[PDB]
Design an enzyme around this catalytic site. Sequence first.
Site, PDB file in Angstrom:
ATOM      1  N   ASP D  60       0.892  -1.149   0.000  1.00  0.00           N
ATOM      2  CA  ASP D  60       0.000   0.000   0.000  1.00  0.00           C
ATOM      3  C   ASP D  60       0.934   1.204   0.000  1.00  0.00           C
ATOM      4  OD1 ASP D  60      -2.626   1.347   2.179  1.00  0.00           O
ATOM      5  OD2 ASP D  60      -1.638   2.230   0.407  1.00  0.00           O
ATOM      6  N   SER D 138       4.752  14.050 -14.444  1.00  0.00           N
ATOM      7  CA  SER D 138       3.923  14.157 -15.626  1.00  0.00           C
ATOM      8  C   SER D 138       4.205  15.483 -16.270  1.00  0.00           C
ATOM      9  CB  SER D 138       2.440  14.092 -15.262  1.00  0.00           C
ATOM     10  OG  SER D 138       1.603  14.287 -16.401  1.00  0.00           O
ATOM     11  N   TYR D 151      -4.861  15.622 -10.755  1.00  0.00           N
ATOM     12  CA  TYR D 151      -3.671  14.848 -11.086  1.00  0.00           C
ATOM     13  C   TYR D 151      -2.493  15.762 -11.267  1.00  0.00           C
ATOM     14  CZ  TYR D 151      -0.652  11.615 -13.542  1.00  0.00           C
ATOM     15  OH  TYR D 151       0.418  10.815 -13.933  1.00  0.00           O
ATOM     16  N   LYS D 155       1.064  15.930  -9.058  1.00  0.00           N
ATOM     17  CA  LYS D 155       2.390  15.762  -9.638  1.00  0.00           C
ATOM     18  C   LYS D 155       3.272  16.989  -9.515  1.00  0.00           C
ATOM     19  CE  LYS D 155       2.017  11.369 -10.910  1.00  0.00           C
ATOM     20  NZ  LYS D 155       2.976  10.378 -10.398  1.00  0.00           N
TER      21      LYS D 155
END
Lengths: 253, 253, 253, 253
Positions: D60, D138, D151, D155
């Site tokens: 995890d 990203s 997202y 990042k």
Amino acid sequence: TNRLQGKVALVTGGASGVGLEVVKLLLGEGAKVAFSDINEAAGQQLAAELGERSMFVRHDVSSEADWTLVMAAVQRRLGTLNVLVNNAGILLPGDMETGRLEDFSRLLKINTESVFIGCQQGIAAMKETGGSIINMASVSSWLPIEQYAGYSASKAAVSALTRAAALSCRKQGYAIRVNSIHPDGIYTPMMQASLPKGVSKEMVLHDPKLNRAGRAYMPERIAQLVLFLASDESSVMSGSELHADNSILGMGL
Amino acid sequence: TNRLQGKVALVTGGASGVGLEVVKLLLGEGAKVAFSDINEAAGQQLAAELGERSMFVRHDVSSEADWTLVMAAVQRRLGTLNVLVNNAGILLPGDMETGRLEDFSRLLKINTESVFIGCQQGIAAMKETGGSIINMASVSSWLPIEQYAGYSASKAAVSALTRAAALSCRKQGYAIRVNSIHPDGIYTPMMQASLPKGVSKEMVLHDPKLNRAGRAYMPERIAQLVLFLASDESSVMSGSELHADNSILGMGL
Amino acid sequence: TNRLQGKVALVTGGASGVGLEVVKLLLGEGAKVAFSDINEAAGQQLAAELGERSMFVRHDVSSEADWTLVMAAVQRRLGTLNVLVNNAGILLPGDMETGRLEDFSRLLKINTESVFIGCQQGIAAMKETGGSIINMASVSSWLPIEQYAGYSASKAAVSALTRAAALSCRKQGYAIRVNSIHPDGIYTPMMQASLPKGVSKEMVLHDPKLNRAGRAYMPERIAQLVLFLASDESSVMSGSELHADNSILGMGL
Amino acid sequence: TNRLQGKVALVTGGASGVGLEVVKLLLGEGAKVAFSDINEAAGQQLAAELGERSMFVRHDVSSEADWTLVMAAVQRRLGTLNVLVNNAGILLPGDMETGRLEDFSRLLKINTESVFIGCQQGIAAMKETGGSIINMASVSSWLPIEQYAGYSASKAAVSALTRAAALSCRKQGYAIRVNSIHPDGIYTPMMQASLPKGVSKEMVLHDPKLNRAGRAYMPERIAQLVLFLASDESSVMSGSELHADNSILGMGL
């Protein structure tokens, strides 16, 4: 002045610090200004002092339900919102080697999720007629500082949310600007009270004659950048960072 | 109306576009404003209309000797300089495959060497008492545009000069801020006359209803950023880029 | 090894420093490598030492005629070029307050115009068959350093040319990647000879144990990044800066 | 062929995509490689097939307890860690206007808190003898994408953690580099299954000749950049972003 007489603002974290300086500058240009914070009794005493163009509302900036109610109450009392200053935040220390995960989680919840909700609901409030959303960030979003790793990350996240919000507004045809402000240190009454005994204000504020390496600035100086972004005169600016660090980059080397 | 009454400004490229609107805005706030322009006849014509607190000066912005004369004449007539707007520049096309070296050399001479000389001599003029130096750059300093490779490079160099000047001022204890402004396109009578016949301003200006992808902006909207940076209220900002591109990043994708 | 067997490279400023280390690493992976520089006798003696897969050519990197000849020669002797390393450059000091314009002009000519010409020539050479173009820049393109204002600007300009070239290549469907490398200080014999009595290699090289604040690095370390970009394994990268400064940002504060 | 023989790596998200390609490249250069993944059926089968130098572990990545156990288990079996690839992450969509707060919270927990823990525990594993930590980010950390607001923020936070970790390592004298990699789209069976009828690999993958506008890349092409950062040859790079978007900036305009 009546420069901003038609502006309707919400300033989160507005009962102290930069937030309170922002509230005072906006009021002084004729805006109507709601400010939110967590100590209700003090906030109400402040709103009484600032007068009827101001309003205090209690607000947990990490709660979506609180934000919905706040947006509705502000606008019922003061009119359609067209300035939102996401200033609420917290500063907690921790380096990458020993900082506590629980402190990082708290920073993300209070600093980053608050801006997400505020921008989400600010877009809904402003999309018909337009406005300006101002996200407080930090120099540390781009300039790493050893003991504020998580805080830096929380504020880098805020600047990404700023760009996402600004781009959505442009692509959807909303006359909404979204920008972030990146100060270095802010000399608030709390900072002053946190200084070691024997450390004075002149030892920490930047001054070109007395302290060229100083890292701290008066809150009103930062508030002036918020006022500029709230005003119509800044409207070509969207999706950007306004840096408020007085040329720190390259210092110390 | 006399908000900037103690400011004494020099604006290069002051007779058209952004520069023209800067001269107007500064004068409108009560400053004294000298300006120069690569189109010298157009500058002399403007000075005859703008009044006693303005002055036009002939200026080869790539000449150190002419800057020396300009800085001396302006201050003899108007007082100690405390605002310098390095706006003179030229736009020439050329991609990396087929563009001409001679155009690139001219872009560097006019766009980049001018900022070097103006900042150097601006520091000399302002180091005792302080001021603000504003360097006009472009979105293209960071956003590549195929047909404007050399122009981009010239403006990236301007941004680097801005940081170096700001840092030296901080390290030397000069109360001088140095910042750059990075606009997208500027709508002017020249741009309009340049468009294919039948193209109207609405086809090139950004507008959230009519033209979300538009790249051009009214020059007064850029000039407002210059005004802010000239004003005392922006003083915490130094060494920074102010972006004036209305969230172009992420468009088109 | 034979890992880069089919690569044919030209490395400008290749007879010393990072350039020479690049030449050696490329040759060591089996490439054919032309290297250019300004001292003919020395360069020829180096080529004799490096052997048959190397070639020295005298080259004025600021001249298109000289480049046309170099490219033809290199390719006549070694085959179709698919790697170009624009490494030639000069480091001259000068701060914004007192640096000489004539020095800035020289920096732009030698550092920035050379990359423009190289990139143009490289696109011509590689547009049908493909390849890599690698532009040497510096940490100072983004990190201001008070005594290297002009050099910074020259290298910021190089980075902008890199992005323009990369974008053109993508838009035009050329299988050409263009990137820049941004080192901090380069430790060479000339750097050493320029240091005051007493300052040793150990006092200027970074070392995690002995010298955490050091700003200089061995040239081969930088040359490794050039090798990666010359290889097919890096092909996804284009239009980017590879920073080679070992976490300088945030130091000193 | 045994170039990375003394390396011991942990790769999160290693059963598919970039992570899998990283596991395979590191194994192919002689390293020992542990990996974890939420798909344990696929992960355990892979480790069986990949041989004695690979190990699969349940993990995890948002749990500080799980990380402690993984770190211990991996180093007991394979030896002292010197490569960490924080690649585990989730892609959940949501724009700023209607994206779910709950999905943003989950993005921060899985994408950002995992890197915090991973870098903190990685520093503890590697501080005595050194190593390389690679954080997957990203293009969207800096390039806003409307449908991936949260997202992108997750990042951008990862990149800030990267700089903080890198700076701590430098200041404390640890021979640890920390860097981030920022790809555009990554072509997997997940995306291809996500794709409508007839939209094939060739339709979405960038191809310098046949699909210039394509935004999807093969995972192995990103894995090559991880391999370079894992390797000793890249050691001058720390605190940096390696951009793997192939000159997207400026496209579409």
